[PDB]
Amino acid sequence: SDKPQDFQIRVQVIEGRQLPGVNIKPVVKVTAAGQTKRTRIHKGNSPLFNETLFFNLFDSPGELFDEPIFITVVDSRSLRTDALLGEFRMDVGTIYREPRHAYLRKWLLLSDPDDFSAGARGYLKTSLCVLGPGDEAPLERKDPSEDKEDIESNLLRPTGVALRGAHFCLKVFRAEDLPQMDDAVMDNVKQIFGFESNKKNLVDPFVEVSFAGKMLCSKILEKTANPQWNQNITLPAMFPSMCEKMRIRIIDWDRLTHNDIVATTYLSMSKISAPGGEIEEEPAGAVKPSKASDLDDYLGFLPTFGPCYINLYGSPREFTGFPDPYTELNTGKGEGVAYRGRLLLSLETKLVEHSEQKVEDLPADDILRVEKYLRRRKYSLFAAFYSATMLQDVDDAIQFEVSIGNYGNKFDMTCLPLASTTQYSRAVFDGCHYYYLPWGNVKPVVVLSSYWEDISHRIETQNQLLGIADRLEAGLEQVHLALKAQCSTEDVDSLVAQLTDELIAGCSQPLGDIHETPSATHLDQYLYQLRTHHLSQITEAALALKLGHSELPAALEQAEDWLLRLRALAEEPQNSLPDIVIWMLQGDKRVAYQRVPAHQVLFSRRGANYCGKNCGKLQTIFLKYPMEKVPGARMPVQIRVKLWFGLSVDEKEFNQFAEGKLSVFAETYENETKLALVGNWGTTGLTYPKFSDVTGKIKLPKDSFRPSAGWTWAGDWFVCPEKTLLHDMDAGHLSFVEEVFENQTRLPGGQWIYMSDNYTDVNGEKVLPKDDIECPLGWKWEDEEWSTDLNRAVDEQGWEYSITIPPERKPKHWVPAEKMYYTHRRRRWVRLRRRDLSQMEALKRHRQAEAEGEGWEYASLFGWKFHLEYRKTDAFRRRRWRRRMEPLEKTGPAAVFALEGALGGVMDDKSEDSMSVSTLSFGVNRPTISCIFDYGNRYHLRCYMYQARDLAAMDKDSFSDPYAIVSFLHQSQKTVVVKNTLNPTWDQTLIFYEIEIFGEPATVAEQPPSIVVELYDHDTYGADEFMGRCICQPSLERMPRLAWFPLTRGSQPSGELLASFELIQREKPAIHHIPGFEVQETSRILDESEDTDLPYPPPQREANIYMVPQNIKPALQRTAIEILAWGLRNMKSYQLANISSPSLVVECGGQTVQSCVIRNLRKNPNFDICTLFMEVMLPREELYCPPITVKVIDNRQFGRRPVVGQCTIRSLESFLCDPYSAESPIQEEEFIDWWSKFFASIGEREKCGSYLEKDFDTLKVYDTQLENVEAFEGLSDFCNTFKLYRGKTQEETEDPSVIGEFKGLFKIYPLPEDPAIPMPPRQFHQLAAQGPQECLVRIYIVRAFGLQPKDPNGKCDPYIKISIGKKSVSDQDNYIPCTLEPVFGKMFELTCTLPLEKDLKITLYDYDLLSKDEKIGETVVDLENRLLSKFGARCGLPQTYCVSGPNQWRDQLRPSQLLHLFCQQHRVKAPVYRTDRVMFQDKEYSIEEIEAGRIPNPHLGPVEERLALHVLQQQGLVPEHVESRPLYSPLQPDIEQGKLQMWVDLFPKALGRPGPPFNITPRRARRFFLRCIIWNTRDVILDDLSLTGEKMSDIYVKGWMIGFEEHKQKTDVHYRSLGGEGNFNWRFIFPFDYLPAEQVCTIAKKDAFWRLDKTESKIPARVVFQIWDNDKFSFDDFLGSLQLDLNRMPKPAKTAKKCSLDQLDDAFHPEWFVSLFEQKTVKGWWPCVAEEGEKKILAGKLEMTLEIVAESEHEERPAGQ
């Protein structure tokens, strides 16, 4: 059940909320099994990560089960020390225990594990999954309505009590203008009773509210559209919730069927509070009175929303009896397109101890005290339309509608004298692709009025704050781009200072007060103080940056954060003003919409800086379809408008924003009939009024008209034809495509028939037959015959079909399909003509043609059916008269607002008959307003397009035939088609002529029209596929440079375009004549030339095709690219066998090369071929130089080639290089060993002694991992690592995670232009010897120290476990129990194949016979780096050469062979000398320089080898060394558990056998049977006396070594000793510990009871033998002692003169002293020292043997004495 298996950990981090701290930049890191990986750094207190990490862990299921996963949220910054924001912990077994082994979409609570009772610290949303031996958990769901709930969506193990409740109290008062929702059947039912009714059906509304799953409902009202509730709803909640939104919805109750929805809205809980803190402890300045910037008790506030209307939006208001196609819009999804009423409410928050749910009625006092907030003022809105372009699919007449709130909606309008809509018009063809509305120099004008609340005190501040942020960005973009322009340093620093100077001045401006505005709310008051505080902080941060000094990026990073702060404070949650909505109508149906925020166009008199951004300015607007998510492949229209909105009291302030002239008109008709029916006509004989309206019932004399107040006459009366069809489509065009539609019809039950004349235009109007169309003068045909247009959605015959024509007679839906119930079909014919310039002067006489003919219409019946041509049957003749009016100079343009309430403000009760406006209004009952321009500005435009890159493929073969369409106001041109490529180059210039733009020249230059470019893929059925588009701005630069623009499609990136645009203004303006002639104000005419000041055109590549100028094109140079593809790593073990056929594809400059295919990833992660050569052309400038893209392709059977990862390189310059290089039975072994060499390297002795006399070499010692040494650059310089991503544009849900890595190197060098020159030497001449290289590994474990305790004794019982790849070897019964700092000296010889099992893991465990062995830490060794090391780190390197002994040569190769390889690897000349001196690289080196001052070396090898060693030592090769490294525990990710001393040797089997490893076994004691023999006792001083008075003593011998009491034995006692007699010949045994290798004696017998081991220590070799008189009837009588050394013992005395105190000395007379290690049988006389403190006096002598024979013979030699 414990079998080792391959497991995978998958952790996904989605989002976090309410993270603590200010200006935090959180990153999430995950640690498991000791391995750490992290997400990218993000900023903000509510970050979104969308990142996935995984871990590949191979171990026993019994070990990974209890292994915790640490999820850490940390604030990482470059300016401040990183700090923890919170942490979460979970095990593996808990996650794996669940079905599918995962927790999906669960919220986790964060807290600080060190800061106790600190409360909750935010929330993190994650998904945690663990996979077993082979299974999957692909399940994913998105349920945002439930996943945002605080209930059973999370787990709270941390700070589980950090929760407090609150009440949210909501007051609901009333609502206005609800739409009709219920059935209208009651309009027919009420009639059955004879009851009156109106078409305003009422609804039965009620309000639902919900928060975090808790829902409450208000009471149901009936039969109202403007309901009153006066209700109070109280809902309980948790304060630190995960929910950001509270929902309010209005439901229309239905007693018979399911309830409908009127509108849904949301309230943001995070925008009505300031949880980040109002004040912070940041006491800037020298003086810090309270150690804070300010002081408060609350430092923040609870969420609140004072009394305010909320505007609702949703689906269209029009009522139908059919299913509604847009119902999702009323559920909160997408965005509303229509106004659906407004709701009044207020919300307050308080903290509570108890929760409850209830609804109560309001007191009357709470109704009558809120009225002060409700007041209305008159607002005025002005709008004008300048153009409408890029139309497609236009079937009917188009008009635009402008409305605000519920004002101006023509479908529910009552009666107004002024229209809210423009007049209907027809589109025309631009001759290339698009249609447009021909408004010309007369612009439509719309004026509206409405009533709303005054909230100016909220808006002015918002405009001010945003104004600051926008100016800051302009500076940042300029300095950001300026840096790349290679600007002077001083200028770049100045630009940074300019950001500071502008920011300070902007923030030094005071905000308006709120205390002067009595209609204040609590939220406004809190925001007022909050904004003031933060502005002071930015003011202080500013300047300080200017006065101090910092790195460029340091200053820039501060500015970016400053910008974000400004945006956040500019938000305004209380906005009672509805937006401005513009609708496009075609026929009587709605097509497209757009919305404009009210504050962007609002005017105020406080100052210019408080006005809306676009107030009085032109805007460019694109309209959208209803229920749309994306821009789409087709855009319904592009328009240009001007808006101004403000209070009626400020109407006079509008005079400064006007352009052109405003006018209104009066009209009347002149009626005539036949006189006496003789063919003559006149006003007599007429039964109708001479002058009348169009109806013919009302008489309207020309002299009865009067201008309204504020207006005067703008001229005299003139004739105005009903239609003016004269126009000119030749807008400077050089070529034009003409079109005609051929129509053929049939009966529903009939067959298709052919008619000789049924031709129409696109608008259904009759046109001249296709064969009778003539080419206009100045133009010639290029096409001889008309062709059929098959680029439309038509069948193979070019026919388009439609169903039987409806009563409206306007078919809208056309299909390519043929059906038997279709009655009409059409085909499109096209033909091209081209300009041929000659004499254009004749055309000047036709520019005055505004109308033709007298303008008379004729009819047989008065009032209707008038014909344009005269007929004999006609009885009546009519024409129309018109006159213009203009505003007085004393009022100005503001007069335009005076028409409302004046035109319809007049009534005259002269009769009982009812009437509307007839005879009171003048002419047309609904007069128009228009703006007329006298002149326009002419421009010339040149577009330079060069190339596009990385275009998305339109098909599986990755081929397409792209071309571009370039569009300006009402002109467009197409480029040439480039075949079979996704990286086309066009090198083409497009030239536009004579584009006319209206408006003041000083404004036109500042706000030019945008340029739109679209790419399409040409095909055999037309360029049906849309590849992408972008929007560009024109430049006025004299000679623009190329720049890149992004292309987008479907919300995804689709490549980039390289282009530039040049706009030239012409000096002479165009003059337009205006009907109703007035005196001209022109005083000067400019005599400018037609084309003589125009810049010369570029040269042609092909007839009529221009190329890009040579001063723009990038310069090219020849380049060669060498790619070293080594192999892939970290590709995971998933599938493996089922994906075992990868290959690489590498491209640059569009040129691609292929790599070989790997056949088995189970055996060879590396490629068989590592040589790739590609030649490309590149631009010289880094700006236009393409990236290198590397893709990994899965080569599946049956030709399937999916991408399984990709990455890019944008730093090609780092791989550049010059193409040129060069060519282009020994006793000494007892104490001489390795151990003392190591001690010697530290300068240590004690264990060395005579070892130091060998004059041997020295090893290096490191205090860390060799990879941590900078001298050898981390020993990872073999190849570079690149990271692969699975990211694609195919799906938006794929995280930009790391999926694997590629290993290799790149080299780039320039080529000569002369092909005769032989190719330079290849950058790589090595073969891919990267195969299955079997090798031997030797692991040396010497000792460990600083280990943390795992038991009550503060000790451990450690042992070594080692594994490589999947092989595991351990030693549990070979260890030292009860130790702190273990010593081993073990060598492990293992066989490994690289790079298959490169990972060497070494771990220590705490042995326990009765329990589980706890891990005390582990380390990792990278073996591959040693094999591939470029420095050489696979073996030791001596300084002194030898062939034998501890310093023997140990490599499989001779020292001269290592030199040979280096000579070949680095391509240098070899040393060629092997004598007394050698010459190399002009340096003369003698052998005498090395051996000087040294002991002659008896083991020194041949000269040739020692010479090689020195020269190798001079190079940066890794020296012989030993090192120690830190151990870590997976449960304490950053805490060291101690360090271990070791090294590793690597020996590849491809080579012959290297010299053997050294024995590093720790020294052990050996007991010696040291011997002493007592031979002769004489001349003893006898201190005691006999009973006879004779001298006598106690004769016996005693002696021992300290700590060896149990090994002591004594002689017997001789009697009657008068002469010091006695001859024992005793053989004493002294079994004492000794270590002859060190030649030091140690003490036996431990005093340690606290451990299973024994004590050991060394002593000075001075042995003291104590002898005291053996008085059986008393205490020991102190007599004296003897002393002799072991290492420096004196030789045997021969005479009395040689037997004294100086003969007991250890080193006083060392020349006479002998080491006993070489003395096997030594006996002699030495004196005895009497007791007297420490004084040295003598009292007799003993002859004793002192010998060491137990080094080999314990009993055998010391015998027979």
UniProtKB/Swiss-Prot annotation:
Record carries keyword Acyltransferase: no
GO biological process per UniProt: macrophage activation involved in immune response; monocyte activation involved in immune response; negative regulation of phagocytosis; regulation of neurotransmitter secretion
Outcome, altering P578R: In MMD1 and LGMDR2
GO cellular component: centriolar satellite; cytoplasmic vesicle membrane; early endosome; endocytic vesicle; endosome; extracellular exosome; late endosome; plasma membrane
One Gene Ontology molecular-function label: phospholipid binding
Consequence the record notes for mutating W717C: In LGMDR2; uncertain significance
Subcellular compartments: Cell membrane, Sarcolemma; Cytoplasmic vesicle membrane; Cell membrane
Main location: membrane
Chain residues that bind Ca(2+) 4: D1671, S1674, D1677
Tissue specificity comment: Expressed in skeletal muscle, myoblast, myotube and in the syncytiotrophoblast (STB) of the placenta (at protein level). Ubiquitous. Highly expressed in skeletal muscle. Also found in heart, brain, spleen, intestine, placenta and at lower levels in liver, lung, kidney and pancreas.
Residues of the signal peptide: none
PANTHER family, A to Z: DYSFERLIN, FER-1-LIKE
Protein name per Swiss-Prot or TrEMBL: Dysferlin
